[PDB]
């Protein structure tokens, strides 16, 4: 809070942080993608898709 | 130059040029394209009985050499001999196409012949990948149409064929109206026309062969993927130009631009082909050759290739097709000039060979469609006429943003989808 309760300090640091996290999420996404990229997506059959690929 | 053609009761055509031997043979205007899915490989089956051991000895004693050829548009049975024995030939041709049209087809010879082509064709489908892929290129490019039938015939329709089928075909196709007897080598024109007119008769004259449905092209692909093969062979083409076409040569010149290449032969890598810059940096393939297959109904313009660089096939195709794009927008003048010189060159070595059995097959096929052979000198006149502007118009119709036929075998996992390759047939514009 940065005070006795939710007041000015709270709302101003909260905006500050609301701006910051999105950029972290974005970073977190690129990792999600890197982790995706080494094995590729799965498929509905739940079996290997190595025999029939399409760009 | 020469090339003379006269009728009678049948049509005869000859081309004499005092050399070594002289060959005479009957060339029929029907072939693989005139067969059916179920009787396919009947012509390739005639070719082997005519070349049977039984008949081969009969002409060998007499001092002759037998040569048969089976194509899509035609069929040919040729007998080679010395300049003087020009009569020894006709007496054999006629003996096997009239007297022995009851013999040969006798069992023990047919069964022997059939067991031999059944193996011969099984060897081809297991080993000759480049030609097999090309055969399948026709198979898919012209599927469900005359031209789609493989010359050697299928391995199945072959083992179902019996003497009856052979006879039925002969009776329906080997006819007076659908035939041309030719003579090349050193034998004169007047010598043949008369030796033929000696023994009269006709043998099924006035009889015409069963017609069909005009061959057509279809954007399609056939992928015979075999991971156990050490290379990846692929052929790819578009709808070409048929013989007796305004652009017969313009199309043939375009292929000569990109030509052929063998990555292992030093001289080949030095050619004046822009594509060879793009393909040599990472050695995209072992070899490749561009063609312009023409026939009576249609044709195929594209290229064939083999590659060991299985992980970069997409670039082989990419660069190769980006070059084809140039023929519509940026083909330079010297590219066209170089093509002419090299077209003329390879065209000449084709016609001007020291083997009449080649010359025969070339004379027959032509006169069997246009009814006359175009003199080599006349060709050069047309070739030199062709302008940059000409190549672009042709490419605009034939090549630019047009469907394609693809066929492949071996490690072709790296050959991208039809739509990916199809897309490269053009370029972005404002």
Swiss-Prot record, chain A:
Subunit structure comment from the entry: Component of the ubiquinol-cytochrome c oxidoreductase (cytochrome b-c1 complex, complex III, CIII), a multisubunit enzyme composed of 10 subunits. The complex is composed of 3 respiratory subunits cytochrome b (COB), cytochrome c1 (CYT1) and Rieske protein (RIP1), 2 core protein subunits COR1 and QCR2, and 5 low-molecular weight protein subunits QCR6, QCR7, QCR8, QCR9 and QCR10.
Full-sequence portion shown in this chain: 166 to 220 of 385
Disulfide bonds: none
Membrane-traversing stretches: 8-39
Mitochondrial matrix side: 40-55
Recorded family membership: Belongs to the cytochrome b family.
Subcellular location: Mitochondrion inner membrane
Chain sites annotated for binding heme b b566: 32
Residues engaged in binding heme b b562: 18
Note: Heme 1 (or BL or b562) is low-potential and absorbs at about 562 nm, and heme 2 (or BH or b566) is high-potential and absorbs at about 566 nm.
Name of the molecule in the record: Cytochrome b
Residues annotated as binding a ubiquinone: 37
Originating gene: COB
Lineage, uppermost ranks: Eukaryota, Fungi, Dikarya, Ascomycota, Saccharomycotina
Species in which this protein is naturally found: Saccharomyces cerevisiae (strain ATCC 204508 / S288c) (Baker's yeast)
Function text: Component of the ubiquinol-cytochrome c oxidoreductase, a multisubunit transmembrane complex that is part of the mitochondrial electron transport chain which drives oxidative phosphorylation.
Top-level taxon in the UniProt lineage: Eukaryota
UniProtKB/Swiss-Prot annotation, chain B:
InterPro entries for this protein: Metalloenz_LuxS/M16 (IPR011249), MPP/UQCRC_Complex (IPR050361), Pept_M16_N (IPR011765), Peptidase_M16_C (IPR007863)
Gene Ontology MF terms: metal ion binding; metalloendopeptidase activity
Gene Ontology biological process: aerobic respiration; cellular respiration; mitochondrial electron transport, ubiquinol to cytochrome c; protein processing involved in protein targeting to mitochondrion; proton transmembrane transport
Gene3D superfamilies in UniProt: Metalloenzyme, LuxS/M16 peptidase-like
Keyword S-adenosyl-L-methionine applies: no
GO cellular component: mitochondrial inner membrane; mitochondrion; respiratory chain complex III
Membrane among keywords: yes
Chief localization: mitochondrion
Entry's localization field: Mitochondrion inner membrane
Protein family according to the UniProt entry: Belongs to the peptidase M16 family. UQCRC1/QCR1 subfamily.
Subunit structure, interactors included: Component of the ubiquinol-cytochrome c oxidoreductase (cytochrome b-c1 complex, complex III, CIII), a multisubunit enzyme composed of 10 subunits. The complex is composed of 3 respiratory subunits cytochrome b (COB), cytochrome c1 (CYT1) and Rieske protein (RIP1), 2 core protein subunits COR1 and QCR2, and 5 low-molecular weight protein subunits QCR6, QCR7, QCR8, QCR9 and QCR10.
Additional comment: Present with 19300 molecules/cell in log phase SD medium.
Annotated function: Component of the ubiquinol-cytochrome c oxidoreductase, a multisubunit transmembrane complex that is part of the mitochondrial electron transport chain which drives oxidative phosphorylation.
Protein name according to UniProt: Cytochrome b-c1 complex subunit 1, mitochondrial
């Amino acid at each position: 809070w940065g005070g006795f309760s939710v007041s000015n300090p709270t709302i101003q640091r909260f905006f500050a942080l609301h701006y910051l996290v999105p950029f972290i999420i974005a970073a977190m996404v690129i990792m999600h993608l890197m982790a995706l990229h080494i094995h590729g997506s799965s498929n509905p059959l739940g079996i290997t898709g190595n025999l029939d690929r399409i760009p | 130059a020469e090339v003379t053609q006269l009728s009678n009761g049948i049509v005869v055509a000859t081309e004499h040029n005092p050399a070594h031997t002289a060959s005479v043979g009957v060339v029929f205007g029907s072939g693989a394209a005139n067969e059916n899915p179920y009787n396919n490989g009947v012509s390739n089956l005639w070719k082997n009985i005519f070349l049977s051991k039984e008949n081969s000895a009969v002409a060998a004693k007499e001092g002759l050499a037998l040569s048969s050829n089976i194509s899509r548009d035609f069929q040919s049975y040729i007998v080679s001999s010395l300049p003087g024995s020009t009569d020894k030939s006709l007496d054999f041709l006629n003996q096997s196409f009239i007297q022995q049209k009851a013999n040969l087809l006798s069992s023990s010879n047919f069964e022997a012949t059939k067991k031999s082509v059944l193996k011969q064709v099984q060897d081809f489908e297991d080993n000759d990948h480049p030609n097999r892929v090309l055969e399948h290129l026709h198979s898919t490019a012209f599927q469900n149409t005359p031209l789609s039938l493989p010359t050697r015939g299928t391995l199945e329709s072959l083992e179902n064929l019996v003497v009856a089928d052979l006879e039925s075909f002969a009776n329906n196709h080997f006819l007076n109206s659908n035939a041309v007897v030719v003579g090349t080598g050193n034998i004169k024109h007047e010598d043949l026309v008369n030796s033929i007119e000696s023994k009269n008769l006709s043998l099924q004259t006035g009889t015409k062969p069963v017609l069909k449905k005009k061959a057509a092209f279809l954007g399609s692909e056939v992928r015979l993927r075999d991971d156990t093969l050490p290379k990846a062979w692929i052929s790819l083409a578009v709808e070409g130009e048929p013989v007796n076409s305004p652009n017969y040569f313009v199309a043939k010149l375009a292929a000569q631009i990109f030509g052929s290449y063998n990555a292992f032969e030093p001289a080949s890598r030095l050619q004046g082909i822009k594509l060879l810059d793009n393909i040599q940096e990472y050695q995209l393939c072992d070899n490749f050759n561009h063609f312009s297959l023409s026939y009576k109904d249609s044709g195929l313009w594209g290229f064939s290739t083999a590659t060991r660089n299985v992980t970069m096939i997409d670039d082989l195709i990419h660069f190769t097709l980006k070059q084809w794009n140039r023929l519509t927008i940026s083909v330079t003048d010297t590219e066209v000039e170089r093509a002419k010189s090299l077209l003329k060159l390879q065209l000449g070595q084709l016609y001007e060979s020291g083997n009449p059995v080649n010359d025969a097959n070339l004379l027959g096929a032509e006169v069997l469609i246009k009814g006359s052979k175009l003199s080599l000198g006349e060709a050069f006149k047309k070739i030199d006429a062709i302008t940059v502007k000409d190549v672009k118009a042709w490419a605009g119709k034939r090549l630019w943003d047009q469907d394609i036929a693809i066929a492949g075998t071996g490690q072709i996992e790296g050959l991208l989808d039809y739509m990916r390759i199809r897309s490269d047939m053009s370029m972005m514009r404002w």
